[PDB]
Symmetry: D2
Subunit: 387 residues, 4 copies
């Protein structure tokens, strides 16, 4: 009764369910899955679509003849299944060429390489129907500041982002560009570390209207930052073009846990934010199954992401309809209209009225906002003691 | 031989050296210092100026008659000493009225109060020669998301910031407005949490040219974020209008340690960034002495902030002149001009040239960037083994 | 239907519900509550008992005559209500005397003061029926390591802990001593930072059998550490003498949120651990209401702590009875008895059997442990979709 | 003039300098180095010794015939060079068999495997002259608590640790066993997370005198904990048998930076602690070169670890000899002998004397400890402005 439908727009990257379970201290625990195989499986599960990096589909150093049989056979599978490919993104982190940056490498040959790799992935994307192009700057950071490179990297990424947007409009591609921040890892620090950082950068590009955000839950949470506040800002800027959903314990390596598995309350209020905002983009699960899992466990991971989202959606809906909740929100959003005309846009006499206004300070000093009761109500709904 | 001069622009808030050493688990360990007293002391130490909140100088509920003797006697002291007051800022965190927000309180009477409090501090500032107005949104955050207030707060702060800038230009004040982010505390999370967050907001105000950043070292570092990356972005945006300098161990309460006392290498490369950028605003030490200190220890704290800054400045200068360092930076900023014309602004034939270009990938795969040697050189300079 | 009974052993420190809502950047938002008043209220709510610091009941500098009317009138209230006082603890953090340590102050006069203050609180405790004495070393840490004091503090706290235990057995008090770790705050770092740290120290005292742990949820979580693992170790050592319950977001100031309000899943498995272990000590809520609250909100905070605990207890019970859950735990705790006799205590021929044993490695390599399904089941129970 | 000598006891694991620079988002950037090659290089650099995992020398699935040519040719190299092998340790993290634990796997076949793998590495160690056996429990943690395994893991590790110690004494090996805590990674949380955790466990083993600690700087720092406090406790317990030295920025993935490269002040006071304590075990650098490095950069990494250690050693020596420093430490370690006889071991009349003693409280309230001056002195020495 919490079954995924295409209107839900649940997507999985090829690399999410396809993760072989290697980590920095361990071998692969799983077999590599064929891309055609995972298209059929995700279709069975009720997924709207599948995302990919260029290297997810066509591994580095594949002759163009073989490159084309691969893409041919993948498109047939998408045709057979009705799966979309909403989002693509160039792998700019794996090649050793990128060891000190893709776009922010000091070597212009390497920045060129990063470039061309991006253009070619844009071309593959269009060949597959992709509408969103994601830029994750995973290799764009430093551990050695003595270089002074932090002064230079802003221009360097403006340049290809601008070049990428111009190439797209030249080719008649319809890409919106979605920028994905991460505070660290694989670099000691990544330059474009926050949602706000990527939001500010956008306003300096040449075609800003083409550019938005792909915030990821684990990325912000890695640094102990509030993901719900960050996504609200992106929404208020009109720049939420894509969202990456998963779970994470604060202040350590990127876990990419199943969605909702660790921070139920944050996931709750996030699903609430997205749904009630009328966000219409993909809900991507950028997560992998635990390393303790076999292939069966991978598909239980996939099913569990989508099911947990649907449970919280229904639950946040019922929470907002509760009479006591409505009564509580009404009382604290209470606005005295005598207060309101001291407010809003500037006028000389509004300032003078304000400075002479007799404010009800002791009344506002004593005021309780009843957020403890409101917060207990939400926890009891989350617990299903009220739902 | 590391003695502060006015061209150094070292400032101290009244509340920094004036901190009585109360904390959430302890009483005050020190006496409250008279403002006139601390102006004479900071003048002796070689400080360019002193900052203040309204309530630092005029405690809440002081009759205007007494308000004026206070301001009179303070101005005389500034006259006697030649100290400036570069920066003022309205205390929007102490009054219980602000328990659930200043500008982001849900009660319009409280948002009005926050407002008027700001206008009045702008007026005091002008009466004292202040040029920078700082906004620290310490009470603007949440611990209960069930309210949905995160959707609303962006317009609510746009409104007063816009109103504040309009009032200023109406009165012929010359204020630049400096916005100070902090990731949490006193709130579980503060909405405007990062440098990037405040940078993005600025681009949505009505008079953006009047608005910049006051990043604080301890604020970014509290969340394990790289302060040097954050300040570089503000500099590249042209929005570094003020900077708050101190020290901090990551991921806990705000310590406000003496500058350079904990993260020497970060302070080093920060002083390097500021100086070599030609930043010309105040160097504010928003820090207090350790709670183990008496008044003597306070002035040793004050002397130590400035002296540590001057030592690193000289050191970063010598580091940059080292022949081996110059040789190392030259080799890795190495640019092949054949790589460069594949670069920079878009053209149809530049894209085609790029996609047909034969890139030297194996050569760039094997390439070491010698950052271990560069990083060891900087540590040895820091240690004075080379300086 | 989740109503607190005395067999639940829910206790509140006087300082929890009595918190006036002052913080490092704000005034008090509430009135100070009379101790007799809060005894009657907690009795109404269904609390087993109330804890106190010496200075919670008798403020510093109260003449012994007045000290005795206070204690007289408090005992009457306890008699009237049937409330217990399970736990007392000397305030060794507030007095400015303790600015650089209580037990770990370098000044022997201050260590003597800390001492005597502890003995006198032991005496008050006995006069009130207290059975557990808690030591929170909040002032025992450093921000300046140049002193070398880290080498000395271990002997210094051995000395008074040993002296305190000897005084108690001399006076015929029945105290068990419960040691409370915290990683930092109010000190930059506190020496006894972890559960493991306090566990190790105990084994060096003279009467170790008298000494155990008071782990606090917020303390361990402040440092991003797993509280459930920490409490399991204390339980396995037989040293869980008391537990302090609340909520906390990782890596910042101590929030002391209402229990279960932030980390539902951790609170779930914690209540499960405690209950199924047969822990019989007090469940203390060391937490305060949000600073946005009036007195009504305080009692909603108190009611919510206990109600949330009871909901989870019932829920963990139901989770453990689920057939699928039982089937899942059975399959993975699966033990082949041929594996087992290679196990357990050493013998020369067991070692030789092991080294010659032909192990089923490929079978164990391919093995999935189905923890994704188990974890999704627990989340669905938590959400009440299954409960 | 900071050249490594064997009395310095600098060791490198084969896996440190041998790290191929693969990470969770990137390919290997370097060639695999031959073990005989790295023995000759480390000998050139001035290293006392080289450590190894079983799989560093003999990769999984090497026939015993080939196993023996390998060990033969390695021993010759050690003979030629005079390098020691102070420490060995079984790789219990890489094999997929260990996906849900080595010693704490729920499958008794896997616990047997972990066991036998340990015994066999103990045998190789003895064949090579090893004196210290290290246990890093990297795979001993959980991300799914629903299993209840946290209750069981303490006995499970007691069992093999006890079995390992008995096997060693049976074989007449001279191993001391060194236990290495880590708070997380590769597991979401690792059970034995802290120095205190491992210290407490030791006291429950059968031959505790054989067991101590191998604390690693990055491990404690990953969780924002103070490594200097943790190492002081191990020293005070007499359990520092080995130490792993490197650098780390708090609250993220394990970086394993070059020693001293990031936290100069912490490294300073650590080298001070070790040296002035008369610690005589190995100084292991468990660190790798940055991923931006070629093989030249690796040896610059290796050289820089040792040189940075020697610079700080000399510096901490000079700091302690400074007259002003000695005068400062003397004044604050000041002990009034009238305070001291209230102190130390219990007596009925000492308690009575204490409770009647008239303490000099106002004098101690006003007391400043001059730690701001002391801390500024140590920073100025660190900076070489005083050295």
């Amino acid at each position: 009764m919490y079954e995924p439908k295409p209107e839900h727009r649940f997507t999985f990257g090829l690399w999410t369910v396809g993760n072989v379970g290697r980590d920095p201290f361990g071998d692969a625990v799983r077999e590599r899955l064929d891309p055609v195989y995972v298209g059929h499986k995700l279709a069975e599960l009720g997924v709207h679509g599948v995302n990919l990096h260029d290297e997810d589909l066509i591994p580095r150093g594949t002759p163009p003849q073989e490159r084309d049989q691969i893409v041919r056979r993948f498109k047939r599978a998408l045709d057979e299944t009705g799966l979309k490919v909403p989002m693509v993104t160039g792998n700019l982190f794996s090649d050793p060429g990128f060891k000190d940056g893709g776009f922010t490498s000091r070597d212009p040959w390497v920045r060129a390489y990063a470039f061309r790799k991006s253009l070619e992935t844009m071309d593959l994307g269009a060949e597959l129907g992709a509408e969103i192009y994601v830029v994750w700057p995973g290799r764009e950071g430093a551990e050695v500041e003595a270089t002074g490179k932090a002064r230079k990297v802003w221009d360097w990424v403006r340049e290809p982002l601008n070049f990428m947007a111009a190439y797209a409009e030249d080719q008649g591609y319809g890409y919106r560009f979605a920028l994905e921040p991460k505070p660290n890892e694989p670099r000691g620090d990544i330059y474009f570390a926050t949602v706000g950082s990527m939001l500010a950068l956008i306003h300096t590009l040449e075609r800003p209207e083409r550019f938005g955000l792909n915030p990821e839950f684990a990325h912000e949470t890695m640094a102990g930052l509030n993901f719900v506040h960050a996504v609200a800002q992106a929404l208020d800027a009109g720049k939420l073009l894509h969202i990456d959903l998963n779970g994470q314990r604060m202040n350590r390596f990127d876990q990419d846990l199943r969605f909702g598995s660790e921070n139920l309350k944050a996931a709750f209020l996030l699903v609430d934010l997205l749904e009630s905002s009328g966000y219409q983009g993909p809900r991507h699960f950028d997560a992998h199954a635990l390393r303790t899992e076999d292939e069966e466990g991978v598909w239980a991971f996939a099913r569990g992401c989508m099911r947990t989202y649907l449970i919280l959606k229904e639950r946040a809906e019922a929470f907002r309809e509760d009479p006591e909740v409505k009564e509580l929100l009404a009382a604290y959003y209470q606005e005295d209209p005598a207060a309101l005309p001291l407010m809003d846009p500037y006028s000389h006499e509004k300032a003078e009225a304000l400075k002479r206004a007799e404010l009800p300070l002791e009344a506002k000093r004593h005021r309780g906002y009843a957020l403890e009761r409101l917060d207990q109500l939400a926890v009891e709904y989350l617990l299903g003691v009220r739902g």
